[PDB]
């Protein structure tokens, strides 16, 4: 059923939000392990495996509406070398991705693609959960201390 | 069946006691909850849910005994800032509410409601069980600082 | 994350709404139940809970967006003095609070707030089915009359 | 197998009689549903689906006479505004139905079409329990009254 | 609840369009089985039940809304010859019911009626789904040839 | 009890075309088990069994009613030499005993044996069926070609 | 534990082997599965989650031998428009990647990383598999016709 030519041109952009988060959750999340920090290990392999369902959405989506997934040009990241980077520069990266969904589910709104933007809005909240989980990690650091906060790692949840 | 007056006001005042203090430990739950405190949302959601079926208590009484249950007039919330500052604030509130209670149940033995006073002292039973949880919880934060009571709070019991 | 200053407004002005609700809902229930009204007492009841529900969502996304949920200011309760009269107050409300929730949805989507209007349009249809339920019991009444109305809600459904 | 131009013609008509009888019923049903009264919303749901497997044996049938079934000619339907003013229209609606059973039975024992008769006379049978039940129905209106008779379809049997 | 007119309205056009495809989609189905192909039967069979699951839908909202639910106008159907021009038919079908619910989506937001606009949100959401399996058999039929199309259709899946 | 001889002499008539139809539903069987036809053996198969239980209950009422069932006589058999003669001659078969049967029918109504004419319309539905069967495959074979064909009949069902 | 620079370098290289079949892999499965193609889809997603085990592997061992995984550089993938240009096109990759495996292979051997060479040979057998089942896949649509060898891969195996 062809899509919008710039609905496409936006699923494809959210896709390429995706394609980063997916490469940059599941390296820190494997940097947390080798360094024995299990609970973040977990709930950061977690967000990557949400990143991937949220790329394979976005794919179905574009092939549907008959336009071409670009899996070709990966973004930019940022994976920084500490707890604390690393936890913020995830942050950022969330932060961008929630403005452009916002900006994209009111185009699709726009132009009448409801389904469209039903799914996004369902993965703008899959996000903003995520968003909820960093802050109160970087918060829970700032208030317990940096060694505190790592101790309370090595254990699995 | 026709209760004293007096009694019946003392269950009113009662009654709008636990009203602050379920809306009080509800929020302060919540306020824990979105910190990360998952401990501390635990026994405040708890303790929130102690003082609806205290409620529910008074309401059935009252209106047993003929009277009108007053839901319409909410006394002053502490809400608090920090961790120390919403336990003690929880604390004090409990505290007047015992003395109040007190007061109800020599009154309810005067007049001979013995059902009402035997309503009465199991609330206040598990009104000093909540201050014995808050006074040690506040005794903790002193031992090992607040830190480690943080730290302490992270993951569910 | 910081959420829009009007938005957090709202959703305070839709928590005020369903902290009358809780208090209206809840004692008119424990009425019933005085006067041997099961069935009412149970579907008020479980409106009561439902309208608790409600608020624990609003209270956790004010604390998300940042903002302070204002649990302290209590509205007009018109609890009403027969069954018609209670129903009728229940329904008054529960349109009243309709109508703030539809203003609130339409200004979430201006400045693209979709898990705050996602949110909310899933609260309304709660309400819409609490208004269903109040409106198909005021016809009863009227169509079967007062009595034959009371004698159906002796026993729980 | 080709068929009986005439059988078929009648099969098509019996088959219109069941499309109207589907449509009305069912919302009938939905009807009694948005009033409360449960007992008849189950009731006549569950003859709408009566209806619908009966139009599904007469579409089969048509089919492996080589005939072309009508789904495109809806006959008139009679809502009616208050139960007992929609329960005579079913009643009116079944009894003119089998009159046309009746005729299109005879006609298919005479050119010998036995199988095709045999489907019509269970099918009958079927309406036949329709009537009684709508029959019953309308005399315990007039037996108790419309009050009585109303409080007793508030809940499911 | 008295609903907005021309939401009603909306409403029961798309009804009318659910009701057609109800009608198609069942005889399409049988034509199907009567041919011997199982798998077309059985998909086309699920999907006339699922326009019967929406055309429930409408109904209950249109009476909750205080409107009339149209069962009596049926729109046109076009039933087709053989299997290609079946598909394509409701192909068609879906194409233009997807276009009325877009409208009708749009005008429930400008009158604030949130609760049927999710509703027809989701209901579209099926109808894209629909709309995607009917896209790929058509394709099939080209890529592989009607012959070895025909026989993959022999059999349940 | 003493049936009448006419009818005796039909139910003997539709054995003997029984007796022919088992043999050669039979035999077709185990030609298309040999071919390697799994799909084509097991519906031969079962229409073979089908047939034996219909020779069944025709010698028991003849017993019953006193007659002597004739097993000694049997019709011509058309075998054939590749899957479309083969299941054209089964049509063939059917068709005439189908034309048998309503003679009967209609004979055993006229001298009011209503049980024979009971059973002999529950085995012209069954023999409808096998109708039903025999023209689809035969339809099949042209739509998708022998070759096609034949291949979707090499794994059971 | 400190590896060997050019072990790690090797690594990081297979490591974005992966990376580009991760990506070409699933959509090329995506793609299968909105054509209908179920059994493409099964097996190419699987494909991909083997490659994305690869990588896992990959940064696993890098990050011990204390090197940086590099997740960044994403490879040229190559599409394709039709199923069998899709496959060839794995093919290719595969096999490029295997010619990268046996030189990293012999290397980490001449420098003692045994581990590293263990745990390579394992990836090497996995992508041998793969190269297996394309190419047969491919030899299938030449034997069979592509037509036939779609038709196959409509239902799950
Ligand atoms: C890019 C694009 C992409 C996409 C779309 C995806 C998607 C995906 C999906 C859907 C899944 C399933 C999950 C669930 O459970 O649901 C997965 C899994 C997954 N994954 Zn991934 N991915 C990806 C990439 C990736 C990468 C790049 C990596 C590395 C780095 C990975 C690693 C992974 C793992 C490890 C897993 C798990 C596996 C198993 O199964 O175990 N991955 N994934
Ligand atoms: C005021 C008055 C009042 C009263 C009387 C009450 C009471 C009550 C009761 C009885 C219950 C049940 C539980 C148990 O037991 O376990 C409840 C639940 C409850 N609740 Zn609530 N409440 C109230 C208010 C409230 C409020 C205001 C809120 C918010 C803020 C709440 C929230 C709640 C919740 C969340 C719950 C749970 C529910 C469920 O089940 O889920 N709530 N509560
Ligand atoms: C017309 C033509 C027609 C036909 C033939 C039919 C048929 C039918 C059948 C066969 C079934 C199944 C049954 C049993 O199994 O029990 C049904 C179901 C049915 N259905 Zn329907 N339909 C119809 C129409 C219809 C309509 C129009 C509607 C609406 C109004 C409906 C609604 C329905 C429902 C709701 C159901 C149930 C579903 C389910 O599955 O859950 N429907 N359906
Ligand atoms: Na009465
Ligand atoms: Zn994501
Ligand atoms: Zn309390
Ligand atoms: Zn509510
Ligand atoms: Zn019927
Ligand atoms: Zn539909
Ligand atoms: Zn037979
Ligand atoms: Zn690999």
Redesign the pocket.
């Given at each position: 059923m062809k899509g919008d030519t710039k609905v496409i041109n936006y699923l494809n952009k959210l896709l390429g939000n995706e394609?980063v988060a997916?490469?940059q959750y599941?390296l820190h999340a494997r940097m947390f392990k080798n360094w024995g920090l299990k609970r973040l290990n977990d709930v950061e392999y977690h967000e990557?495996?949400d990143e991937?369902?949220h790329?394979?959405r976005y794919?179905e989506r574009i092939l549907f509406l008959e336009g071409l997934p670009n899996?070709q040009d990966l973004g930019k990241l940022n994976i920084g070398e500490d707890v604390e980077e690393m936890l913020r520069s995830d942050l950022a990266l969330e932060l961008d991705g929630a403005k452009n969904l916002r900006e994209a589910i009111g185009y699709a709104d726009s132009v009448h693609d409801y389904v469209s933007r039903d799914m996004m809005i369902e993965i703008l909240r899959d996000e903003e959960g995520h968003i909820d989980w960093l802050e109160t990690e970087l918060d829970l650091i700032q208030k317990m201390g940096l060694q505190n906060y790592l101790q309370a790692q090595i254990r699995e949840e």
């Open positions: 394609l997916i490469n599941f990557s495996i991937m369902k790329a394979d794919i899996l």
